[PDB]
Amino acid sequence: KELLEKDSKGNIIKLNEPSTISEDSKVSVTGLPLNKGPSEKIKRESLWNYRKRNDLKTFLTENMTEESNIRSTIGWNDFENEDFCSACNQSGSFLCCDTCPKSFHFLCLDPPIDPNNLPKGDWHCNECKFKIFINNSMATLKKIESNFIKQNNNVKIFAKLLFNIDSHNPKQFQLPNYIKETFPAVKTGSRGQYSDENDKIPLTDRQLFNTSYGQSITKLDSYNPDTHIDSNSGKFLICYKCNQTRLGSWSHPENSRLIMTCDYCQTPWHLDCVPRASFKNLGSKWKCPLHSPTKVYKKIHNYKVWKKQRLINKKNQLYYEPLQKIGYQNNGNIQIIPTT
């Protein structure tokens, strides 16, 4: 709005101040603008009661500061598209199909699209592009399928497989169910990620942030003696290593040692007998030291690794009893039978 009022020769004369009142009253963190002070509604509970020297030495620094450049490196040294990706079923920044209500991640497409080198005009998905290709061509779908089979005479059996995946939109690879049902311990997460028996049930936000001040999931901010007592038996959780339960006395709560239970065999352990500072509230399930490992590394003197076999459902898992008792080379995958 004519900020600089130049003269006839281009010389500056006088400028006009812009709209200060445009953002002079923006809401700050106080809830009020910086122009004004506190209101009475918040002055009531803040002040105790509401009724209806310049000897500074901090200005001497600029003078007493000497620059410093003595380093060795000185100088130089319509419809709304979805809000979940159609390929991986996850949220993020999407490239939206124009004539199709599906949305895809920029990395989820074939070929993946750079987030700065976008298509200039319109972008269709693979299914949509196949739809326009079919509608533009006069011949029907089975005619093009037969033509593609006959033209690709080198491979016949995969030709129908080759034809139909040009129409399929790109999707993230997921293991089929029959690969997942053979292992009952293996679960699928919310994002499709891996999950198994060594994974905790995720704690809801009602447990983490919706709890009282003194009582925290961390069990470190207060003296909680209702953790040395078994809930379903009423007895005392005796720690395995020290063979004691340090419950404390509530007059000397520093005499109480924290105790946790294993997430697999429920063996109670003190926080000091096994060296641990956390309680393992979320993430993976905590394993006590008494459990046999499912993965070990041994030195060849390279190395060799061994992993225990995954659990298999009862319809596809065979338990067999050796005939040889002594020296039977089992893969380390064994089962203990009672001794009679």
Which residues 120-139 are close enough to bind Zn ion by CB under 5 A? 125, 128
Binders of other proteins in range 177-236 (CB under 8 A): 178-180, 182-183, 186, 189, 192-196, 200, 202, 208, 211-214, 216-218, 220-223, 225, 228-229, 236
Of 127 and 145, CB closest to Zn ion: 127
Of 128 and 159, CB closest to Zn ion: 128
120 is written with which tokens? Answer: 């200039």
What, of Zn ion, other proteins, none, does residue 259 touch, CB below 5 to 8 Å by kind?
none
Under the criterion CB under 8 A, does residue 140 sit at the interface with other proteins?
A: no
Cβ(137)–Cβ(143) below 8 Å: no
Contact with other proteins (CB under 8 A) among 140, 266, 294, 309: 309
Dihedral, 127, 132, 136, 141 alpha carbons, nearest 10: 20
What, of other proteins, Zn ion, none, does residue 125 touch, CB below 5 to 8 Å by kind?
Zn ion
Contact with other proteins (CB under 8 A) among 2, 8, 52, 66: 66
What, of other proteins, Zn ion, none, does residue 265 touch, CB below 5 to 8 Å by kind?
Zn ion
Under the criterion CB under 8 A, does residue 102 sit at the interface with other proteins?
A: no
Of the candidates 282, 270, 261, 267, which has an alpha carbon nearest to the alpha carbon of residue 216? 282
Under the criterion CB under 8 A, does residue 339 sit at the interface with other proteins?
A: yes
Give Cα 125 distance to the centre of its chain: 28
Q: Which residues does residue 299 pair with via DSSP β-bridges, in sequence order?
A: 303
Helix/strand/coil for 160: helix
- The span from the CA of 336 to the CA of 332, in Å, is 12
What, of Zn ion, other proteins, none, does residue 262 touch, CB below 5 to 8 Å by kind?
Zn ion
Binders of Zn ion in range 141-170 (CB under 5 A): none
Burial (0-12, 13-18, 19+ Cβ within 10 Å), 157: exposed
Dihedral, 113, 118, 124, 126 alpha carbons, nearest 10: -10
What, of Zn ion, other proteins, none, does residue 57 touch, CB below 5 to 8 Å by kind?
other proteins
119 is written with which tokens? Answer: 């298509």
Angstrom CA distances, 105 to 84, 89, 166, 266, stand at 9, 10, 19, 44
Contact with other proteins (CB under 8 A) among 8, 68, 204, 232: 68
What, of other proteins, Zn ion, none, does residue 132 touch, CB below 5 to 8 Å by kind?
none
Contact with Zn ion (CB under 5 A) among 113, 242, 258, 274: 242
Q: Which of these segments, 23-31, 99-107, 188-196, 197-205, binds Zn ion (CB under 5 A)?
A: 99-107
> Beta strands 303-307 and 187-188: pairing type?
unpaired
Under the criterion CB under 8 A, does residue 299 sit at the interface with other proteins?
A: yes
- The span from the CA of 216 to the CA of 224, in Å, is 10
What, of Zn ion, other proteins, none, does residue 197 touch, CB below 5 to 8 Å by kind?
none
Contact with other proteins (CB under 8 A) among 99, 107, 130, 287: 107
Please report which helix (H) or strand (E) contains residue 103, including its range.
strand 103-105
Under the criterion CB under 8 A, does residue 72 sit at the interface with other proteins?
A: yes
Cis, bond preceding 111 (omega within 30 deg of 0): yes
Contact with other proteins (CB under 8 A) among 2, 8, 23, 51: 23
Of the candidates 319, 293, 317, which has an alpha carbon nearest to the alpha carbon of residue 306? 293
Of the candidates 105, 104, 98, which has an alpha carbon nearest to the alpha carbon of residue 79? 98
Contact with other proteins (CB under 8 A) among 2, 8, 13, 138: 13
Of 143 and 241, CB closest to other proteins: 241
Dihedral, 182, 186, 188, 193 alpha carbons, nearest 10: -120
Binding site for Zn ion (CB under 5 A): 85, 87-88, 97, 100, 105, 108, 125, 128, 239, 241-242, 262, 265, 267, 270, 273, 288
